[PDB]
Symmetry: D2
């Protein structure tokens, strides 16, 4: 079928697009950099099994993919934001508005733009790549964490109405997911190269390692395949057993 993966160069983007592509789907890919022809052309040459698009806005993008390939069967809203850790009083309200715009308004805008066509033919799959931080919040990241929570619930809520139209909706919330060259959350440097970071991951996750782009891709492809639509409304915690809670003194 035809799928859309946003911010393809970051977070869960490459893992999702590459695996969906290998499953035989036509993967239209969005990314802020594709605004420039040079950047879109470079990506296209590197990944001929992918279809990079230049469109940036929700409605614009859904329409271009629909016109180019016929329709949008799968939506993978891989949302990202660059937050700063900050005490609640040191943030600017604008800082929270920005987090909400990127992690809640954006996914909502994409579904708002594609829902009608999916509902008319009674088929489609919606997947939000959110975060697991709501399940185990760190101190001083209130804007990002709360925003991601809104996104998770958005997915769960949407599943309730779209189910009638045979449209499953899921939210995959990762943490400690290797992002390779992307700074979006866990790049190879320093997460696989620095001793302190390696030891941190080994302590905080049950599997004692970062999650792989492949694991994420497999999950995305599995859900988009229509192999298990009954999981609609599910919020997945792709966090490898995180969080590992500090035990009493004397316990290793």
């Amino acid at each position: 079928s035809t799928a859309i993966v946003t911010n393809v160069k970051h977070f869960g983007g490459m893992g999702s697009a590459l695996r969906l592509s290998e499953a035989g789907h036509t993967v239209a890919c969005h990314d802020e950099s594709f605004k420039q022809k040079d950047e879109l052309e470079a990506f296209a040459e590197t990944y001929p099994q992918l279809k990079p698009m230049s469109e940036q806005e929700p409605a614009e993008l859904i329409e271009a993919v629909t016109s180019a390939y016929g329709q949008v069967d799968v939506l993978v809203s891989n949302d990202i934001f660059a937050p700063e850790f900050q005490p609640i009083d040191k943030y600017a309200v604008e800082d929270y508005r920005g987090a909400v715009e990127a992690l809640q308004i954006r996914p909502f805008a994409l579904v708002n733009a594609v829902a009608s066509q999916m509902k008319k033919r009674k088929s489609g799959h919606i997947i939000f790549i959110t975060s697991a931080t709501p399940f185990g919040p760190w101190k001083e990241l209130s804007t990002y964490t709360s925003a991601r929570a809104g996104a998770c619930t958005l997915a769960n809520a949407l599943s309730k109405e779209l189910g009638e139209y045979n449209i499953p909706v899921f939210a995959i919330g990762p943490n400690y997911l290797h992002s390779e060259d992307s700074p979006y959350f866990y790049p190879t440097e320093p997460w696989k190269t620095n001793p302190e970071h390696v030891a941190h991951v080994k302590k905080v996750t049950a599997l004692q390692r970062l999650g792989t782009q492949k694991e994420l891709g497999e999950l995305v492809a599995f859900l988009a395949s229509g192999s298990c639509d009954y999981l609609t409304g599910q919020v997945f915690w792709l966090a490898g057993g995180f969080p590992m809670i500090e035990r009493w003194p004397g316990m290793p």
Copy 2:
């Protein structure tokens, strides 16, 4: 001490302000109508124990209450929004922005404005009145429901950073909470007077009745009293046992 209750005329506003005042607290009250001298004076006459403020914006309000009464010890962010039920594709993206602005950005801005004074003296209580809807989403209310979830997580996340400063943070999520004359969610008319509505409440809640402002007020006053700070981070489900789940055919 000194407390602030926003949108006092609606939702959990009156129950909160009334019980807090009966507790002996100085209660400064905010409300959109207080922009009108007439409305402010009339309120002050009916509830002489309460101190209505004309200030509307977060920073403005915290400053006004601080100058007038010395400091803000308790913040009750009683947030409201009037959403429409709509299939995802029928909403305007602006409809989600409005919901998020009123239910997430506002409480965030109020804490952002008062946190520094609380942290300096290492004392204060923060209470968000959110919603139990995220716990049991209805079909077609994705904007309001997801926004409320962000607010619940905001509170929990904040409890993590403010705990070091001895500042408890709670979120009270009601549903089917009687609002008396306020149209915000459950006014006396028609919820206590129309058969179909009375019957609906009886079916969906375990206690088979609306919750009372008195009950909400007792909880707010209890948490603000400093009698049980150890519940910091709690999301309270003030919904009378909702949701009651439809059982199999033939079962009573």
Copy 3:
């Protein structure tokens, strides 16, 4: 690899064994009926790809499969119980003991018996088929629902310690999952044949249909394939969007 699926004739048993066998695994199956020679042989003739075992107890079952096929790589504890709907005071305390023994003690015993061999070679997958009822309890099913909750948490807790040994642990909680000829919860008759039952399912689930054994098996096979171990600790709500909550009067 070698998998074990318990109570194979009921609940999530057939979907799990069938799809696991299709994935190329050797599937040893347990069932109370296999105690009888006639039953075991009739099953082996009908499903020649499956390996019915006569063993009934945890330790002997794990030992027999290990001796016959070498080792137990995957454990699918498909637990069942036949509860009665009763007001708390009409139950016998023994009724709860029986529910806990069947839904909590059994899976714990199976893991207790196989854990050491999986830990030694640092490989294996543990999957509990539990229930979604804890997520949305009905009245008068306190014994079954609470017990199932104990099982979900058991899986999650186990993921924390077994992760260090590369052993993912999952809990699949279904509801409204078609069980075909098995009375364990949703047999074809009357769930797909009687108007009121069909209409009931269309009302309380988002997808407005029963889940299929195929969907359950696909999930079980996906998880056992080692394609997404990073989901360890996950409790899956295989309930098609259930529960759908009754909305305000006037809303369809």
Copy 4:
């Protein structure tokens, strides 16, 4: 009214019993040690405001309290168990049976014995003192943790059926709750006196301190007063913001 607090010398026992008595309630207390006249009379002399009972079994206790003090209006099931920490394969299945018997079967049996009388009057309150561990499992404590989860769900489930009879049901899940002289979970020695332990608590809790019996007592009395029945079904996380999650390397 008349309240029953079990295992009064341990866990949330004294805090609950003492505050309930200060509130004016007649508080019948149960404890395994009260089987000895010596221990019972000694307790009675020290706390003339409490009424220790010798009865050990549920049915016997409810009848004894009903006969001596008219009826049972409030049940505080303060359940305890002394678990060992161990990898799943090192436990004895009997170890899990003991945990479930003490933490799940016991509270169930007590409600099973007093429910009929409360339903008849259509009044009463049920409070289970469980645990917050299910919310943040430590590895190697799978028996205790999962059993506690079962008890939490048992409460929420019962609220669904008992609400129709105006009987609120709650579950208070503590962690890091100071237990003073009782070894049940957090005694003064060493939690308030040994550096390594004091520091551990400082690290894992948001408020950076142990919870006080007074706090637990206030919550119990508040809920038992009928001041806020609309919270029925609630699972309270009385853990001071626990768990605090370890942050990235370099972060303070």
